[PDB]
Write a protein that binds this DNA or RNA. Sequence first.
RNA 1: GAGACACGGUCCAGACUCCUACGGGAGGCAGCAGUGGGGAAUAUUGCACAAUGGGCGCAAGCCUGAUGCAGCCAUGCCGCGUGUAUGAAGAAGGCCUUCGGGUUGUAAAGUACUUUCAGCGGGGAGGAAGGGAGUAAAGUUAAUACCUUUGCUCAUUGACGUUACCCGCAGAAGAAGCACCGGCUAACUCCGUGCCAGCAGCCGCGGUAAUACGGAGGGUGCAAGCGUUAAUCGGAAUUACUG
Lengths: 123, 82, 130, 125, 205
Amino acid sequence: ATVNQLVRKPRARKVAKSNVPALEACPQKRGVCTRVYTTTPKKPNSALRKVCRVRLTNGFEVTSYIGGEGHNLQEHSVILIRGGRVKDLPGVRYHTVRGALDCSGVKDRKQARSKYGVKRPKA
Amino acid sequence: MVTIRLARHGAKKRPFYQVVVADSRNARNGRFIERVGFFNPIASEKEEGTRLDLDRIAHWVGQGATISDRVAALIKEVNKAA
Amino acid sequence: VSKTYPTLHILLQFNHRGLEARIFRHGQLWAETHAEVVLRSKTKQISFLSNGSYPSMDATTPLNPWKSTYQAVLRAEPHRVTMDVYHKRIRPFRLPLVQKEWRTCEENVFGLYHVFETHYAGYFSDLLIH
Amino acid sequence: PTLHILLQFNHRGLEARIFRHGQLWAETHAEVVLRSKTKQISFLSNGSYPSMDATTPLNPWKSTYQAVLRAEPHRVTMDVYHKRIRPFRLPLVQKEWRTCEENVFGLYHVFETHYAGYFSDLLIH
Amino acid sequence: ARYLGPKLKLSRREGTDLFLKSGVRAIDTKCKIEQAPGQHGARKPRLSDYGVQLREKQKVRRIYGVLERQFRNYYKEAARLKGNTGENLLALLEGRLDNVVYRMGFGATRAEARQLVSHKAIMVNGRVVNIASYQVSPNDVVSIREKAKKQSRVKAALELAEQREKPTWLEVDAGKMEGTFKRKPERSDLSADINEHLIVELYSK
RNA sequence: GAGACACGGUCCAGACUCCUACGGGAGGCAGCAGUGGGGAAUAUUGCACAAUGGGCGCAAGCCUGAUGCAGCCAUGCCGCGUGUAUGAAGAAGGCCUUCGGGUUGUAAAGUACUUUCAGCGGGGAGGAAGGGAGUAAAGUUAAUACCUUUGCUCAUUGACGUUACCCGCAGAAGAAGCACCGGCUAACUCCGUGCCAGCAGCCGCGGUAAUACGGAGGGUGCAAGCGUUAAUCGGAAUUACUG
Ligand SMILES: [Mg+2]
Ligand SMILES: [Mg+2]
Ligand SMILES: [Mg+2]
Ligand SMILES: [Mg+2]
Ligand SMILES: [Mg+2]
Ligand SMILES: [Mg+2]
Ligand SMILES: [Mg+2]
Ligand SMILES: [Mg+2]
Ligand SMILES: [Mg+2]
Ligand SMILES: [Mg+2]
Ligand SMILES: [Mg+2]
Ligand SMILES: [Mg+2]
Ligand SMILES: [Mg+2]
Ligand SMILES: [Mg+2]
Ligand SMILES: [Mg+2]
Ligand SMILES: [Mg+2]
Ligand SMILES: [Mg+2]
Ligand SMILES: [Mg+2]
Ligand SMILES: [Mg+2]
Ligand SMILES: [Mg+2]
Ligand SMILES: [Mg+2]
Ligand SMILES: [Mg+2]
Ligand SMILES: [Mg+2]
Ligand SMILES: [Mg+2]
Ligand SMILES: [Mg+2]
Ligand SMILES: [Mg+2]
C-alpha cells in the first residue's frame, strides 16, 4: 500500500503456466500412438469418447482426443496433435489433427470440412 | 582513410543515394561520420535530383578526405550547372 | 480455335510408402495405380519424373512420414502427345516443371495412358478401375 | 474419327455446324425451336421433343452448344457443353452408344439417328 | 475483391435503397424492398446495439462497394486527419475516383463507373488513371478519353444523371464529357440518412 | 604486423573423418549455394561485376557468393481482377407451406455493351556516370617535349532483359472460396439420430417434435484467402506509480 513499502518490496505478477505444457510453445507436435481406446466422460455426460495415448518427439507421453465420427488410428500410428483440452474428459489436453500424417479425414463431411481434413467434393 | 562515397538507400530498381563521409573500412550502408547530401539517379524533372553541402565537403577535403569517383562527378555537376 | 483433344489429369503423390497415381477424367476419378517409388527430395522426384526411372530409392520410414504431390496433364494432340507436370498445382500460363512429348498418335484415353505407363515402364502395377 | 459440332438454337430452328480437324466439313438445319434449357436439354437427351415453340420474328434468341463426338475403340461418346467445351469440368449431358464406327460418315449416322427425322441432308463444302 | 452477387438483395437487407441499379425503373418494381431476403424474410426481430452499429457500417460499405480491409484503412486515415473523424471518413469515400465518375454522370451506377475507370477510359488531369480508389483532389479535371466518347452507355448515363440531384462541389460538361472537382463535399452536401457516429463507435470496441 | 593472440594463418593437445608402401601424413560451411540429420516448420549447388562499395595498381585493368539482380514460397502488407447495363414467363428445378402460396430471385436465361488483367503481336524509357582514342589552350620546363589541368571531337560500355511502360488483336471469354448461424455474437428452418453417434472458448447440448449433434435449403461475416493451434499485450482497477 504505502510507497515506502513499495520501495522495499515492489508488486509482483503471476507467472502464468500454460495449459498445454507438452507442446513447448509449438503450434503442433508429432507423436506415435502408444494405445488407442475409449473412455467415459464425467457427469452429467454419457458417451464413449475416442482417445489415444501419444509419445511425442520431445519424450512427453500425453493423451489426445480424436474428434469426428470414425477414425483409422491404430497402435504405431504417427499423428499430429494441436492443443485444446476436452472439457469433459479428465486429463485430455490435446486434439489430434485430422487429415495430417497418418490420421485421415472424416467421411461424408460436408460442412466445416477444413476442421476435419476433408477435401472439397468435386462434381 | 576517411572517404566521401555513396550509400545505396532506396528500393529495388529505384535506387537512391546518400552522400556520406565515412571511414573506408566500414560497410557501404554501415557506420558513417557525416551525411552531406543526396543523389537521386532516376529523379523526375522539376525535382531536386542532387543536393550537396559544398561547405562541409570542402571542410573534409581540407582535412584529407578523398572523394569517390561518382561523387567527384556530382560536384562538377553542382558547380557547372550553378 | 479450340484445342480440345483427349485429356488426362493425373494426381501423383510421392510418400514414404511409395508413389500413388490417381487418374481423373472430366474431374471424375477414373482409375488408380501404385508404384514402389520412394524418393524424398524434390530434386530426385523431378529427376525420376523426367527420366522415367531412378537407380536407388530412399528408405521407408514409418515413424517419420511425408507426402509430396504433383499433377501431370496429358493431352493427345493430333500429331503428338504432351505431358506437363506441375509441382502441387496446375499453373498453365507458367511453364511446366517437367515437359515430355512423343511423336506417336493415340486416338483414345487408353492409348494416352499407355504412353504414360510405357515411360514409367516396370514401375506401376496394373490399373484398378472404377 | 472426331467431329466438333457447333449447335445453335434460335427462333428460326436448330443450326448444326460440323467441324473436322478444325475445318468446317458440313452444315445442316432443323426446324427445332425450343427456348428453355430444360426443353433444349430434354431434346438433347431424348433426341426428340413433342411440341416446338412458335417462331418469333420480333424477338431473336440465340443459345449455343457444342457436341464433341469421339470414336473410342469400343464405344462412341457425345458430350455437349453449354456455351463452350471445358474438359476439367463435367459434361452437362452425357451419352454413350455400344457401337463400333469405321469413319466420320458412320459417326454422323449415329448423330443423325439419335435426332432421327429432324436434320436435312448434309450440305458439304 | 468485389461483390459479384445479387444487388437488390443487399438493399432489401439494409431496408433502404443503395442505388445499386441504374434507376430506370422504380426499385419497388423489381423486388420486395420492404422485406429482407431469404426464407425468414417476413420476420423482423429486434436488433441489439452491436447489430445496429454493424448494419450502419455495412450500408456505407455497400453504397461505395469497399471491402472491410480497405474500409478499415479509411477509418485510420480519417481518425489521423485533423477534424471530425466521422466527416473525414465520408470525404475520403467521396474522393474516390469511381465515385467521382458516378456523381459527374459518366456512370449509371458506381459498379459501372468502376468498370469505366478500370478499363482505362477515364483521365485525371490529362493522364489515364486506372485505380478505382484513386483519391481525387480539388481543382482536378477528370474527363473521358477520346476513344471512349463513342460508347452509348456513356451517353445513356448522362441523361440519367439529369434525373438525379446535381452535386454542388462538381462542374461537369456533358458536351466535352469533362468535369472539375473543385472542393471536397461538406457533410451537408451528402445524405442525411447516414449516421457516421455509429461507424466511428464500431471501430473503437 | 600500424593493427590479431587472427573465420577460409602458424604451433601443441584432444575428439572425429580421411590417405598410407604402416614408417607417416591431411582436414575444419556459425562465408554463398548445397547434402545428411533434427524439427510443426523456413528457399536455387542461378546470373553479373552493368551500378554502388572494397583490395592492389600510375593507369588500363584484375579480384570481390560484398553487392546488384533472377528463381522458389499467399509468409506479411498494399493494389487490381474474377465483368457492366437490362431483364418477370417473378420460368424450371431446390427448399418451406397454414396447400392459398412463399423463398431461392433480377438471380439465371434472354438482350444490348465493355476488354483492366491474363493470352498473342508490335513498339520502347531509365538505371551510364565514366573510361578510351584524338586534338586545342593553359600550367610548369632549356624545351612549342613528357606530364597535368580544361574544353571540344570520334567510337563505344546493362547482369536484370523477351525491362518498366505504350499500341494493336480476338472474345465474357481464362479466374471464389472459407468459417459461422443456443446465449455471449451479426445470421433459422426442415429432415436424420435418440444421453447413442457426436459437439464444446465459457455457460452448456444430446434420454423422440434438437434454431447446439449430422445433412439440406436459406442466411451472416470475411474474401485470394478463410479457419484452427501456439505465442504476447489488452480488456484485468485481477500487484492498483498513475489506480
Ligand atoms: Mg460449421
Ligand atoms: Mg487484398
Ligand atoms: Mg480525427
Ligand atoms: Mg602490416
Ligand atoms: Mg615490417
Ligand atoms: Mg610486434
Ligand atoms: Mg579476438
Ligand atoms: Mg584470416
Ligand atoms: Mg570456413
Ligand atoms: Mg550454407
Ligand atoms: Mg534435409
Ligand atoms: Mg525430418
Ligand atoms: Mg533444394
Ligand atoms: Mg563492381
Ligand atoms: Mg577467384
Ligand atoms: Mg502474391
Ligand atoms: Mg417452384
Ligand atoms: Mg497484358
Ligand atoms: Mg540507357
Ligand atoms: Mg541520365
Ligand atoms: Mg454457437
Ligand atoms: Mg443474434
Ligand atoms: Mg461444432
Ligand atoms: Mg426426452
Ligand atoms: Mg428431430
Ligand atoms: Mg494492469
